[PDB]
Amino acid sequence: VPISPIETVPVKLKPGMDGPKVKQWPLTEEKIKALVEICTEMEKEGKISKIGPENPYNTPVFAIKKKDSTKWRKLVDFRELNKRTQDFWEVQLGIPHPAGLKKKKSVTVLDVGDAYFSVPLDEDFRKYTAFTIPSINNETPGIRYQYNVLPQGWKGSPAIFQSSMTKILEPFKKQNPDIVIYQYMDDLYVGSDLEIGQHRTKIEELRQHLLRWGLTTPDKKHQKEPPFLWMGYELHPDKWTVQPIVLPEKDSWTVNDICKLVGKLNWASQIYPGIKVRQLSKLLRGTKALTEVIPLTEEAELELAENREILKEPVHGVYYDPSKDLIAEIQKQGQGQWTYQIYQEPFKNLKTGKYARMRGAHTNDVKQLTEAVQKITTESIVIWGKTPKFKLPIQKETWETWWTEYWQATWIPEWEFVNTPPLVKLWYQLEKEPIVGAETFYVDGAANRETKLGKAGYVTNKGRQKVVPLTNTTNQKTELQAIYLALQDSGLEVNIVTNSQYALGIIQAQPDKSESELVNQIIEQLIKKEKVYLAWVPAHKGIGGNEQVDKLVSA
Amino acid sequence: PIETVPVKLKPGMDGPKVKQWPLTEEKIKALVEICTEMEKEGKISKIGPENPYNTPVFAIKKKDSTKWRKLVDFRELNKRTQDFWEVQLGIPHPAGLKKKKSVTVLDVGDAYFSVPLDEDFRKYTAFTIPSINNETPGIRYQYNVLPQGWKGSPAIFQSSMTKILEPFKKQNPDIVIYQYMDDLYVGSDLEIGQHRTKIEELRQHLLRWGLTTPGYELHPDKWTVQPIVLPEKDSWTVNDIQKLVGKLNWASQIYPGIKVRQLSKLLRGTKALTEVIPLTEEAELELAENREILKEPVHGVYYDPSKDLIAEIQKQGQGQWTYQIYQEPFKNLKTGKYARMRGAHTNDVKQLTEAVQKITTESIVIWGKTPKFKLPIQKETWETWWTEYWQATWIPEWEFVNTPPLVKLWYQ
DNA sequence: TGGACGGCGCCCGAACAGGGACTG
DNA sequence: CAGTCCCTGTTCGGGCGCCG
Ligand SMILES: OC[C@H]1O[C@@](CO)(O[C@H]2O[C@H](CO)[C@@H](O)[C@H](O)[C@H]2O)[C@@H](O)[C@@H]1O
Ligand SMILES: [Mg+2]
Ligand SMILES: [Mg+2]
């Protein structure tokens, strides 16, 4: 017989499909050494088994060195078995953030020893694990082996491991309601308000508990020793920080260089306030080769300078005090870039972050502020389970004007005004009623689908008129164009009548920024006016000035 | 103890796989506790990653309640059981319900826990409980009994229900009773006291069959419509007549009788918007004959039970919200306005949330169906807050629209 | 050497969806 | 009427970061 450790989780292939037959890699003997080495050591313990050719399945395998170790780590590429294996439901729903930890008097961190290998595979499934082991190049075939436990590289390994592990920890935790255990993969963070002696008792009890299930806890455990290394962070009794971030120094930048770089900077932005990736990311747009070398703009060069400088000074986050409120304050950084700090006691930050996302062809700061407030809420709800009270650089009246008037449902949760500039505003406002004594411009434009040639023009109650010819255009653009002309040729107060739905919807949403250069100029003009009233009439109803300027811009 | 009625998903369709969304701390606590007592009562039992299927779960408090209710968002499973509860074991709809002077809604969902569930089905009721700050991986479950808020539950229990009900349907021959999912709709033309009393009677009557009742009172004969209305002015400016013609022009896709020529006439020049236009004879009459058509019915609009309801909502400002329920465009089976709901003048998402529930409810009373909503809101804005305001045990289908108001058709 | 798995985050670009306006 | 075209907005996959 072989032996059975802890309750197994049933597995299957995707019905009416069969296993992993593919030939092994031309592996360099250096690895082949390290391989048969730990291979053989398995079987004594029940991890693998030899198999009669009655097992018709083969899949390649090769080790990669374990980082920060002399030791080597074993990976079986199961990709072809994964493809044909039943789908699972991942139980890892996200990552724990340090800023979410409450303050604990005493804290232990223990890694599980050979975690995937201490967990039983499924009986009926085991066969499918079949792979074949080299000896040395050209010497012999090498023996074929079937796993008795969870292989590294299957697609089911993480979910089954985490699930089993939790099932095991349930009774201890139920036995110790006041112990906090953060369980992530095989990493355990144990903490308590116990006095360091009693606490360590419990640590030992737990190590014992995990032992009953075959789960080793070596003494490669942080005991008395702040800082603890956890999830890429350093944990201190009152503070935490990211493990130091190295940013490449390269004199000539490739595309891959900027990716590593950018992603490093996004990781950094959870604590160092004010990181900006905008101009550096601009550099990756419409490039072919990840290998290709690309030059840094004086924009992306400037950005990178201040980002490195932010990193210069050591910063740290604090922990969470459920008794006190959470506060998120937001600063506008320019070019649709936003940073925020979530804190409790002024100046002691839980975490920081940025919202840079450009959403829409035309938008404004109020919308992007709303977007960031929502980004920040969900984030908060994940980590602390509650929404921060918000401190925002937008006047309370600015906001009341926007949301009441907007045609869409919009909301910000409980929040208060902070007078830190730049303040968020609305740069212009359309009148709700036509302006007495203001010239009324009827505008239209049309364009020919085939020529892509067109006209944009206007007619007015005062007799004023214009028609402008345009090239390589569209119907929409000529309508925008007609409005632009009416804005340009008119006084500080103006009534404009368009039949364009497209143009009218854009402008009514009070954009302050656009991808379209034409919209930007329109915006630019709108800001200079004292009063603009925009009205819509249907086309081709023989309405008023609308009929006349419709004629003019067809001709 | 009972015979489990088998269930299959609609042909050539697979179970729901839908990620669980973040929960606030109070909801995770409420759920962790609810699920404990549900495990120890055998209604649900823990499971593992082997089961590929998942449905979102969260919790709510009914209107004025203060007690948490578990709510599963079964919309995706129900779409894949749709066959079953319409074609085979489904429920008939009482066209008289809407005429009653009062209708009370009771939560009978607890009853469904009695019946067990086809064992081959439970794999599909899978739902994960999240942890705050991802302390723990997800604690997964699946249902051993008829789950609340599955469309299969009130159907399988229909036989049981009718039996428990039958005595009281006979004692009270004319009181209409409808069942839509976890709810029992009950209505009478009795005065308020008689009505309330008789509800209590139905309650006891439900109790000795082993069920509770944690009731909402509607009044379908109070429910009004919101016709399209043209304004009343002593003088008309050019703007006014442009705005008017635009509206009538749009209205003409509904009421074909509408005429703009005599009103268009007033607009002939190129005139300043604020300039006053007195109204010609033939325009005064055309405007009149229009006002009258907008009083009429639309020709040939009726409800077709094979087609989905669609609900559009518009935000009118100042608390007001207008809506229209329809099956085919421009043929509206009903149109309405809401004002001063909870959150008026402070929170749109709460008001919109309130409006979607009120509208859904009328559709349940009237047609026994829920509409698919077209919501005037950004997906993220809604998806961030809607659960916070959700007071109801069902969840309609929705999609999100951006439609600027070039004309105000539905509200002056 | 070139190379496996799950989770989450950012950013990008290609592909898909649908709505209004014009064109046979 | 159907079939294009603009245009705008979503969704999805792939690249990197980070965790085991
Ligand atoms: O599923 C993607 C995304 O949409 C949601 C709600 O926005 O999906 C649910 O709602 C849809 C619209 O009613 C349903 O069609 C769908 O079946 C249902 O899952 C969320 O679940 C999710 O965030
Ligand atoms: Mg380990
Ligand atoms: Mg035109």
Ligand SMILES: [Mg+2]
């Ligand atoms: Mg779930």
